[PDB]
Coordinates of C-alpha atoms and ligand atoms in Angstrom, one line a residue:
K1 CA 109.4 121.8 97.5
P2 CA 106.2 121.7 95.5
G3 CA 104.1 124.3 95.2
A4 CA 100.0 124.9 96.2
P5 CA 97.5 124.9 93.7
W6 CA 96.7 128.1 92.2
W7 CA 93.2 127.9 94.3
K8 CA 94.8 127.0 97.6
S9 CA 95.8 130.5 96.8
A10 CA 93.2 132.2 94.9
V11 CA 91.0 135.1 96.4
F12 CA 88.0 134.6 95.0
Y13 CA 85.0 136.8 94.3
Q14 CA 80.7 136.0 93.7
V15 CA 79.3 137.0 91.3
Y16 CA 74.9 136.0 91.9
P17 CA 74.0 137.8 88.2
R18 CA 70.5 138.3 88.5
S19 CA 71.0 141.5 91.0
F20 CA 74.9 142.6 89.9
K21 CA 74.2 144.4 86.7
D22 CA 71.5 144.8 84.5
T23 CA 72.5 146.0 81.0
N24 CA 69.2 145.9 79.3
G25 CA 66.5 148.0 81.6
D26 CA 64.9 144.6 82.3
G27 CA 65.6 145.3 86.1
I28 CA 67.6 141.4 86.1
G29 CA 71.7 141.3 85.4
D30 CA 73.1 139.4 82.9
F31 CA 76.2 138.3 81.1
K32 CA 76.7 141.9 79.8
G33 CA 76.7 143.7 82.5
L34 CA 79.6 141.2 84.8
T35 CA 81.5 141.6 81.4
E36 CA 81.4 145.4 81.7
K37 CA 82.1 145.3 85.5
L38 CA 85.5 142.7 84.5
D39 CA 87.8 145.8 85.0
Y40 CA 85.7 146.3 88.1
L41 CA 86.5 143.1 89.5
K42 CA 90.1 142.7 88.8
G43 CA 91.3 146.5 90.0
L44 CA 90.0 144.8 93.4
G45 CA 92.6 141.9 92.8
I46 CA 90.5 139.2 92.4
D47 CA 92.0 135.8 90.6
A48 CA 88.4 134.2 90.1
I49 CA 84.3 134.5 90.3
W50 CA 81.7 131.8 91.5
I51 CA 78.8 133.1 89.7
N52 CA 75.6 131.4 90.3
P53 CA 73.6 129.3 88.1
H54 CA 73.4 130.3 84.3
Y55 CA 71.4 128.1 83.2
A56 CA 67.5 127.6 81.4
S57 CA 65.3 127.8 84.1
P58 CA 62.3 128.6 84.9
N59 CA 64.1 130.7 87.9
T60 CA 61.0 129.1 90.6
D61 CA 64.9 129.0 93.1
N62 CA 66.4 131.7 90.7
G63 CA 68.5 129.0 88.4
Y64 CA 68.8 126.1 91.1
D65 CA 65.7 124.6 89.0
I66 CA 67.4 124.2 86.0
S67 CA 65.1 123.0 82.2
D68 CA 68.4 122.9 80.2
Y69 CA 71.8 122.0 81.3
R70 CA 73.4 123.5 77.6
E71 CA 71.6 126.6 77.2
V72 CA 72.1 130.1 79.4
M73 CA 69.3 131.4 80.6
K74 CA 67.4 133.8 78.7
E75 CA 67.6 136.6 81.0
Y76 CA 71.4 136.3 81.8
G77 CA 72.0 136.8 77.8
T78 CA 72.9 134.1 75.0
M79 CA 76.3 131.5 74.7
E80 CA 78.3 133.8 72.5
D81 CA 77.5 136.3 76.1
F82 CA 78.6 133.1 78.1
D83 CA 81.2 132.5 75.3
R84 CA 82.3 136.2 75.5
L85 CA 82.2 136.8 79.3
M86 CA 84.4 133.9 79.4
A87 CA 87.2 135.4 76.8
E88 CA 87.0 138.4 78.3
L89 CA 87.9 136.8 81.8
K90 CA 90.9 135.4 79.9
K91 CA 92.4 138.2 78.9
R92 CA 92.7 138.9 82.3
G93 CA 93.9 136.2 83.4
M94 CA 90.5 135.4 85.8
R95 CA 89.1 131.9 86.0
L96 CA 85.5 130.9 86.2
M97 CA 83.4 128.7 88.4
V98 CA 80.4 127.9 87.4
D99 CA 77.6 126.1 89.8
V100 CA 76.8 122.7 89.3
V101 CA 73.1 122.2 90.6
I102 CA 73.0 118.4 89.8
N103 CA 71.2 116.9 93.3
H104 CA 68.2 118.4 91.3
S105 CA 66.6 119.3 88.3
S106 CA 63.6 122.0 87.0
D107 CA 60.0 119.6 86.6
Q108 CA 60.4 121.4 83.5
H109 CA 63.4 119.8 82.4
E110 CA 62.7 117.3 79.4
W111 CA 63.8 114.3 81.3
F112 CA 60.8 114.6 83.5
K113 CA 58.2 115.5 81.2
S114 CA 59.2 112.0 79.9
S115 CA 60.2 110.5 83.2
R116 CA 56.4 111.5 84.3
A117 CA 54.3 109.5 81.2
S118 CA 54.4 106.1 82.4
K119 CA 56.1 103.7 84.9
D120 CA 57.6 101.9 82.3
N121 CA 59.4 105.6 80.3
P122 CA 62.7 104.8 79.7
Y123 CA 63.7 107.9 82.2
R124 CA 61.1 107.1 85.1
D125 CA 64.0 106.1 86.8
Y126 CA 66.1 109.6 86.3
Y127 CA 63.7 110.0 90.0
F128 CA 62.0 108.7 92.7
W129 CA 58.1 107.9 92.2
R130 CA 56.6 105.7 95.0
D131 CA 53.6 104.3 96.0
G132 CA 52.2 106.4 99.0
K133 CA 51.4 104.6 101.9
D134 CA 48.5 104.2 104.7
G135 CA 47.2 107.2 102.0
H136 CA 49.0 109.6 102.5
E137 CA 52.4 110.3 101.1
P138 CA 55.6 107.2 100.8
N139 CA 56.8 108.8 104.1
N140 CA 57.1 111.7 106.6
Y141 CA 60.5 113.5 104.6
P142 CA 59.7 117.1 105.0
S143 CA 60.9 119.3 102.0
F144 CA 62.8 122.2 102.8
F145 CA 60.8 125.1 101.1
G146 CA 57.3 123.7 102.7
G147 CA 55.0 120.7 103.1
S148 CA 55.8 117.0 102.1
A149 CA 59.3 116.0 100.3
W150 CA 56.9 114.1 98.3
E151 CA 54.6 115.4 95.8
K152 CA 51.6 112.6 93.9
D153 CA 51.7 112.9 90.3
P154 CA 48.3 111.6 88.9
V155 CA 49.0 110.6 85.4
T156 CA 50.4 107.9 87.6
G157 CA 49.2 108.1 90.7
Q158 CA 53.1 107.8 92.2
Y159 CA 54.4 111.0 94.2
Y160 CA 58.3 112.0 92.9
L161 CA 60.5 113.0 95.8
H162 CA 61.7 116.8 96.1
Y163 CA 63.9 117.7 98.9
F164 CA 63.7 121.1 97.7
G165 CA 60.6 123.1 95.5
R166 CA 57.7 120.8 93.9
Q167 CA 59.7 122.3 90.8
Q168 CA 62.9 120.9 91.4
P169 CA 62.5 116.5 91.5
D170 CA 65.5 115.1 92.7
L171 CA 67.2 113.3 90.6
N172 CA 68.1 109.6 91.1
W173 CA 72.3 108.7 90.8
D174 CA 71.3 104.7 91.5
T175 CA 70.5 105.2 88.2
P176 CA 74.0 104.4 85.8
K177 CA 72.5 105.9 83.0
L178 CA 71.3 109.2 84.3
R179 CA 74.8 109.5 85.9
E180 CA 76.4 108.9 82.4
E181 CA 74.4 111.8 81.2
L182 CA 75.3 114.3 83.8
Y183 CA 79.1 113.1 83.3
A184 CA 78.6 113.6 80.0
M185 CA 76.9 117.4 80.7
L186 CA 79.4 118.6 83.2
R187 CA 82.6 117.7 80.6
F188 CA 80.4 120.3 77.6
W189 CA 80.7 123.0 79.7
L190 CA 84.5 121.9 81.2
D191 CA 85.2 121.2 77.1
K192 CA 84.3 125.1 76.8
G193 CA 87.7 125.8 79.6
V194 CA 85.7 126.8 83.0
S195 CA 88.5 126.5 85.5
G196 CA 85.8 125.4 88.5
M197 CA 82.5 124.3 89.6
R198 CA 80.2 124.2 92.7
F199 CA 78.7 121.4 93.4
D200 CA 75.1 122.6 94.8
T201 CA 73.8 120.2 97.8
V202 CA 76.9 117.8 96.8
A203 CA 76.0 115.6 100.1
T204 CA 72.3 114.7 99.3
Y205 CA 73.2 112.7 95.9
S206 CA 72.3 109.2 97.7
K207 CA 69.3 108.0 98.5
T208 CA 68.5 105.7 101.0
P209 CA 67.1 103.1 100.8
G210 CA 63.6 101.9 100.7
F211 CA 62.7 105.5 102.4
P212 CA 62.1 104.6 105.5
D213 CA 59.9 107.4 107.7
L214 CA 62.3 109.4 109.6
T215 CA 62.9 108.8 113.5
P216 CA 61.5 111.4 115.7
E217 CA 65.3 111.8 116.4
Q218 CA 66.2 112.5 113.0
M219 CA 63.0 114.6 111.9
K220 CA 64.7 117.2 114.3
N221 CA 67.6 117.9 112.0
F222 CA 66.3 115.8 108.7
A223 CA 68.9 117.8 106.8
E224 CA 71.3 115.6 108.0
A225 CA 69.7 112.4 107.6
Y226 CA 69.6 113.5 103.9
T227 CA 72.8 113.6 103.3
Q228 CA 73.3 109.6 104.7
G229 CA 72.6 108.2 101.8
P230 CA 74.8 105.3 101.6
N231 CA 76.4 105.5 98.1
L232 CA 76.9 108.8 98.6
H233 CA 80.9 108.3 98.6
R234 CA 80.8 106.0 95.6
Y235 CA 79.4 108.2 93.6
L236 CA 81.8 111.2 93.8
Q237 CA 84.3 109.0 93.4
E238 CA 83.1 107.6 90.4
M239 CA 82.7 111.5 88.6
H240 CA 85.7 112.3 89.5
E241 CA 87.3 109.1 88.1
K242 CA 85.2 109.3 85.1
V243 CA 85.1 113.4 84.8
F244 CA 87.5 115.6 87.0
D245 CA 90.5 113.1 86.5
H246 CA 90.2 114.4 82.7
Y247 CA 90.4 117.9 83.7
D248 CA 92.2 119.7 86.1
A249 CA 89.1 122.3 87.2
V250 CA 88.9 123.2 90.9
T251 CA 85.9 121.5 92.5
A252 CA 84.2 122.2 95.2
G253 CA 81.2 120.7 97.4
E254 CA 78.4 122.9 99.4
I255 CA 78.4 120.8 101.9
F256 CA 74.8 121.2 102.9
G257 CA 73.9 119.0 106.9
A258 CA 76.2 117.1 107.3
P259 CA 78.0 116.4 110.4
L260 CA 81.6 118.3 110.5
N261 CA 83.5 114.6 111.2
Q262 CA 82.1 113.7 107.3
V263 CA 83.8 116.4 105.7
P264 CA 87.0 114.6 105.5
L265 CA 85.5 112.0 103.6
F266 CA 84.8 114.9 100.7
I267 CA 88.0 117.2 100.5
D268 CA 90.4 115.0 101.6
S269 CA 92.7 114.7 97.9
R270 CA 93.3 111.1 98.7
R271 CA 89.8 110.3 97.9
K272 CA 89.9 111.7 95.0
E273 CA 86.5 113.5 95.0
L274 CA 86.0 117.1 95.2
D275 CA 89.2 119.4 96.6
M276 CA 88.0 121.8 98.5
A277 CA 84.7 121.9 100.7
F278 CA 81.5 125.2 101.6
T279 CA 80.2 124.0 105.4
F280 CA 77.7 125.6 106.8
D281 CA 79.0 125.3 110.6
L282 CA 80.2 128.8 111.0
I283 CA 77.6 130.8 108.7
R284 CA 74.8 129.1 110.8
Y285 CA 76.4 129.2 113.9
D286 CA 73.8 131.5 115.2
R287 CA 71.0 130.3 113.3
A288 CA 68.1 127.5 115.0
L289 CA 67.2 124.7 113.8
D290 CA 64.0 126.0 111.3
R291 CA 66.5 128.0 110.2
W292 CA 64.8 131.1 110.5
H293 CA 65.2 132.0 114.2
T294 CA 68.1 133.4 115.7
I295 CA 70.5 132.3 118.7
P296 CA 72.8 135.0 120.8
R297 CA 76.4 133.5 120.6
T298 CA 79.7 134.9 121.4
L299 CA 82.6 135.4 119.8
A300 CA 84.1 132.7 121.3
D301 CA 81.6 130.1 119.1
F302 CA 82.3 131.9 116.4
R303 CA 86.2 131.2 116.6
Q304 CA 85.9 127.9 118.3
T305 CA 83.7 126.8 115.4
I306 CA 86.4 128.0 113.0
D307 CA 89.1 125.8 114.9
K308 CA 86.4 122.9 114.3
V309 CA 86.3 123.3 110.9
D310 CA 90.0 124.4 110.2
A311 CA 90.8 121.1 111.9
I312 CA 89.1 118.7 109.6
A313 CA 91.0 119.8 106.6
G314 CA 94.0 117.9 107.9
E315 CA 96.8 117.3 106.0
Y316 CA 95.3 116.3 102.8
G317 CA 91.3 118.2 102.9
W318 CA 91.0 122.3 102.3
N319 CA 88.7 124.3 103.0
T320 CA 87.2 128.0 101.6
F321 CA 86.3 130.4 104.5
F322 CA 83.2 132.8 103.8
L323 CA 81.3 135.0 105.8
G324 CA 79.1 136.0 103.2
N325 CA 76.8 134.5 100.5
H326 CA 73.9 134.6 97.9
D327 CA 71.7 132.0 100.7
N328 CA 72.9 134.3 104.0
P329 CA 72.0 137.5 105.7
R330 CA 74.8 140.4 104.7
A331 CA 78.5 139.5 106.6
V332 CA 78.8 143.2 108.7
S333 CA 75.1 143.0 109.6
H334 CA 75.5 139.4 110.6
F335 CA 78.8 139.2 112.4
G336 CA 79.8 143.2 112.4
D337 CA 77.6 145.7 113.4
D338 CA 75.9 147.5 111.1
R339 CA 74.9 151.1 113.0
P340 CA 75.2 154.1 111.1
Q341 CA 78.8 154.5 113.3
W342 CA 80.0 151.1 113.7
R343 CA 79.1 149.7 110.1
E344 CA 82.7 150.9 108.0
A345 CA 84.8 149.8 111.5
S346 CA 83.5 146.6 111.7
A347 CA 82.8 145.8 108.3
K348 CA 86.9 146.1 107.8
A349 CA 87.5 143.9 110.7
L350 CA 85.4 141.4 109.3
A351 CA 87.2 141.9 105.7
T352 CA 90.5 141.3 107.7
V353 CA 89.1 138.0 108.7
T354 CA 88.4 136.5 105.7
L355 CA 91.5 137.6 103.8
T356 CA 93.4 135.6 107.1
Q357 CA 91.5 132.4 107.4
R358 CA 93.9 129.4 106.3
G359 CA 91.5 128.3 103.0
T360 CA 90.4 129.8 100.2
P361 CA 88.6 132.8 100.8
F362 CA 85.0 133.6 98.3
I363 CA 83.9 137.2 99.0
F364 CA 80.3 137.6 98.7
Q365 CA 79.1 140.5 96.2
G366 CA 79.1 144.1 97.7
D367 CA 80.6 142.9 101.3
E368 CA 83.8 145.4 99.9
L369 CA 81.5 148.3 100.0
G370 CA 80.4 147.3 103.5
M371 CA 76.1 146.6 101.9
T372 CA 73.9 145.9 104.8
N373 CA 70.4 143.8 105.6
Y374 CA 67.8 144.9 104.2
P375 CA 65.0 146.4 105.7
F376 CA 61.9 144.5 105.0
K377 CA 58.0 146.2 106.2
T378 CA 56.4 143.0 104.2
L379 CA 56.1 139.3 103.9
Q380 CA 55.1 141.2 100.3
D381 CA 59.1 142.4 99.9
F382 CA 60.8 139.0 100.0
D383 CA 60.9 136.8 97.2
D384 CA 62.1 134.3 98.1
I385 CA 61.0 130.4 97.6
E386 CA 61.9 129.4 101.1
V387 CA 60.6 132.4 102.9
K388 CA 56.8 131.5 101.3
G389 CA 57.7 128.0 102.7
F390 CA 58.1 129.0 106.4
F391 CA 54.4 131.0 105.7
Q392 CA 53.8 127.6 105.0
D393 CA 54.7 125.5 107.4
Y394 CA 54.7 127.7 110.7
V395 CA 52.2 130.9 110.1
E396 CA 49.7 128.2 107.8
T397 CA 49.7 126.0 110.3
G398 CA 48.6 128.2 113.2
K399 CA 52.5 128.1 114.9
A400 CA 53.6 131.7 114.5
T401 CA 51.9 134.7 113.5
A402 CA 53.0 136.4 110.0
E403 CA 54.7 139.4 112.0
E404 CA 56.3 136.7 113.9
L405 CA 57.7 135.3 111.0
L406 CA 58.4 138.9 109.2
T407 CA 60.2 139.7 112.3
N408 CA 62.4 136.9 112.3
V409 CA 63.4 135.9 108.9
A410 CA 64.2 139.8 107.9
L411 CA 67.5 139.4 110.3
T412 CA 68.0 135.9 108.7
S413 CA 66.3 135.7 105.0
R414 CA 68.4 134.6 102.2
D415 CA 67.0 138.4 100.1
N416 CA 69.1 140.2 102.4
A417 CA 71.8 139.3 100.1
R418 CA 70.0 139.5 96.7
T419 CA 69.4 143.0 96.7
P420 CA 71.0 144.5 93.7
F421 CA 74.8 145.9 93.9
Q422 CA 75.2 149.3 94.6
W423 CA 77.1 150.9 92.2
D424 CA 76.8 154.3 92.7
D425 CA 74.0 156.8 94.2
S426 CA 72.5 157.4 90.3
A427 CA 68.5 155.4 90.2
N428 CA 68.3 152.4 91.7
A429 CA 72.5 152.4 92.5
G430 CA 72.8 152.4 88.9
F431 CA 71.9 148.4 88.8
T432 CA 69.3 149.1 86.3
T433 CA 67.9 151.8 84.2
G434 CA 64.4 149.9 84.9
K435 CA 62.8 148.7 87.5
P436 CA 65.2 146.3 90.1
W437 CA 63.3 143.0 89.9
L438 CA 64.0 143.2 93.9
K439 CA 64.3 146.6 96.1
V440 CA 67.5 148.2 95.7
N441 CA 68.6 149.1 99.7
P442 CA 68.1 152.9 100.6
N443 CA 71.6 153.1 101.8
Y444 CA 73.1 153.3 98.4
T445 CA 73.6 157.4 99.0
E446 CA 76.2 156.8 101.4
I447 CA 76.8 152.9 100.5
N448 CA 78.3 153.0 96.6
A449 CA 81.2 151.7 94.1
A450 CA 81.8 154.6 93.0
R451 CA 82.3 156.7 96.0
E452 CA 84.2 153.6 98.0
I453 CA 86.3 153.5 94.8
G454 CA 87.5 157.6 95.6
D455 CA 88.3 157.3 99.0
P456 CA 91.7 155.9 100.1
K457 CA 89.6 155.5 103.8
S458 CA 86.8 153.1 102.2
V459 CA 86.2 149.8 103.4
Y460 CA 86.5 149.2 99.4
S461 CA 89.7 150.4 99.4
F462 CA 91.0 148.5 102.7
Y463 CA 89.3 145.6 100.9
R464 CA 92.0 146.2 97.4
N465 CA 94.9 146.3 100.5
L466 CA 94.3 143.0 102.3
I467 CA 94.3 141.9 98.9
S468 CA 97.4 143.2 98.3
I469 CA 99.1 142.2 101.5
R470 CA 97.5 138.6 101.3
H471 CA 98.8 137.9 97.7
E472 CA 102.5 138.9 98.5
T473 CA 102.6 137.0 102.0
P474 CA 102.2 133.1 101.5
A475 CA 101.5 132.6 105.7
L476 CA 98.7 134.0 105.2
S477 CA 96.9 131.4 102.5
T478 CA 98.3 128.3 103.2
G479 CA 100.2 128.5 106.5
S480 CA 99.5 126.9 109.7
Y481 CA 96.1 128.8 111.5
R482 CA 96.4 128.8 115.6
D483 CA 94.2 130.3 117.9
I484 CA 96.1 132.1 120.5
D485 CA 93.0 132.1 122.6
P486 CA 89.4 130.2 121.8
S487 CA 87.9 130.9 125.0
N488 CA 88.2 135.2 124.6
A489 CA 85.2 135.9 123.5
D490 CA 86.6 139.8 122.8
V491 CA 89.8 140.1 121.0
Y492 CA 90.0 137.4 118.2
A493 CA 93.6 136.3 118.1
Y494 CA 95.9 133.8 115.7
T495 CA 99.0 133.5 113.7
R496 CA 99.7 132.3 110.8
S497 CA 102.8 130.5 109.9
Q498 CA 105.0 129.0 107.6
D499 CA 108.3 128.9 106.5
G500 CA 109.3 129.8 109.2
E501 CA 107.5 133.5 109.1
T502 CA 104.6 134.0 110.8
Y503 CA 101.8 136.7 111.3
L504 CA 99.6 138.0 113.4
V505 CA 96.0 138.6 113.1
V506 CA 94.6 140.7 115.7
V507 CA 90.8 141.9 116.0
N508 CA 88.5 143.8 118.5
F509 CA 84.9 142.4 118.4
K510 CA 83.7 144.5 120.9
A511 CA 82.6 148.8 120.3
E512 CA 84.6 149.4 123.4
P513 CA 88.3 149.9 123.7
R514 CA 90.5 145.8 124.5
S515 CA 93.7 145.2 125.6
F516 CA 96.1 142.3 124.1
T517 CA 99.2 140.6 125.5
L518 CA 101.2 138.6 122.9
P519 CA 102.0 134.6 124.7
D520 CA 104.7 134.3 126.1
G521 CA 107.8 134.9 123.8
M522 CA 106.6 136.5 120.2
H523 CA 107.1 140.5 120.4
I524 CA 105.7 142.6 117.3
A525 CA 108.2 143.1 114.4
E526 CA 106.5 144.8 112.2
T527 CA 102.2 146.1 111.5
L528 CA 101.6 145.4 108.0
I529 CA 98.1 146.9 108.0
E530 CA 95.0 148.4 110.6
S531 CA 91.8 149.9 110.7
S532 CA 90.3 151.5 113.3
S533 CA 94.0 152.5 114.9
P534 CA 95.4 155.8 115.9
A535 CA 99.1 154.3 115.8
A536 CA 101.1 151.0 114.9
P537 CA 102.5 149.0 117.7
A538 CA 105.9 149.3 118.8
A539 CA 109.1 147.5 117.5
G540 CA 109.4 145.0 120.1
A541 CA 105.6 145.1 121.8
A542 CA 105.0 142.9 123.6
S543 CA 100.9 143.7 123.6
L544 CA 98.3 146.0 122.4
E545 CA 96.0 148.3 123.0
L546 CA 93.2 148.5 120.8
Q547 CA 90.1 151.1 119.5
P548 CA 86.7 149.7 119.2
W549 CA 86.5 147.3 115.7
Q550 CA 90.4 148.1 115.5
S551 CA 92.1 144.9 113.6
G552 CA 95.5 144.8 112.2
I553 CA 98.3 142.3 111.1
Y554 CA 101.1 141.8 112.4
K555 CA 104.5 140.0 111.1
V556 CA 106.1 138.4 114.3
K557 CA 109.7 137.2 116.4
Ligands
LIG1 CA1 69.3 142.6 82.2

């Protein structure tokens, strides 16, 4: 029949350029570093890479505050280096997905420098400027990065809106001329051959008319209210009509803060908005509302959340799947057990899950090596502007002590994912010849690409084999998904099926032996791969005995 888009069967790798590979000793990764490592990614089996922002930026949010959408970030290289990265990817049959940050720009962008000059400036309405009320801000909106989402500018006496940092003013999508500027910007990169675009905080583009105060209830989860602008889908549909309908690039949205029942509006292919969804339900399934505390959860919660997310894709939508990214703690530390004796086994188990979920998997740089959270010792060990925001909102206000913030944010911080990639065991793990912008994890002596690649029993080798198996088994990418028992908090088991072929995935999430009884009528036919198992089951088995953290993929009958 008709086939599926290349993107539904692709395995993506996310590169955070700043921490991938430095080639000039300034301690910051760059395009030349990434280009020199394309053979490494191709050898691992990667089809496409998504890079974080690579545009001109003051870096108050490491690329997410853009001052010029048509120039490359100085730290990464030049437009020539970007062009070379593209060409080398193409020589290897690989595709590039870039990050698109158009909910807001840097306050250094020329549009903002113009906007702030006067109320009658032609660019005034490229942003949101409003009078304060009752001697304070326009309304009670809080910022994700600390304090109020409203900043007064004495040049005009009004306040501008910023959901994120003070140096990331929100762009005004209710203004036609600004929407047209953004479309022309997207075409600039698409005309260069870019194959995909990831839309940063795509659900917050539409603002609420009149900016009334959030109710006390809404305030509890302000992220959600910010995703309820009345014109959101109208704007996304217009972006598709004027830009994406004219190219063959895949689009994916970072649907931050929106309730899961609204995700189909963004990804149902019939609506002509986005192709794939990046949801937060699973990766933040154990995160408190303040985003810096954790809440104990079990595998039952994990799988039940995945069931809900899969159901939302319905028949016309499509999900991405990921256990890690640049805004969350390290996969093995977060969902696995990173203790020395369990790190490799649990990282392999999580690899099995990642590569057998229904959706397009994104492997975050370093997770294929089993990289872990970083041992922060003081609040100064964090670079992340979000941690400074928590200090402002919780420590300076007396709600928590600096020690309490350190203790808790150490387990949830985005910086856990941003320590430099561990290439080998030379100075700073071969990431740089200079001083890394963020400290390298001392565990690079045990966790590094050179050692991983030379060992058939490594986490890396396991990911590589899982990727080969997935590429050879259509059911593992586009097949249906059925969780055999959503209530089981010990062993995660599900089937993937397509065209009469069914595969069974069984993953022990406990560090103790466990048993698993197959569904009535189901029996093992073959064993494709297992991790931490002393032996594959016998053909015909109606049950399995699992070692701690063991994972396996089996073709059933
Ligand atoms: Ca560099």
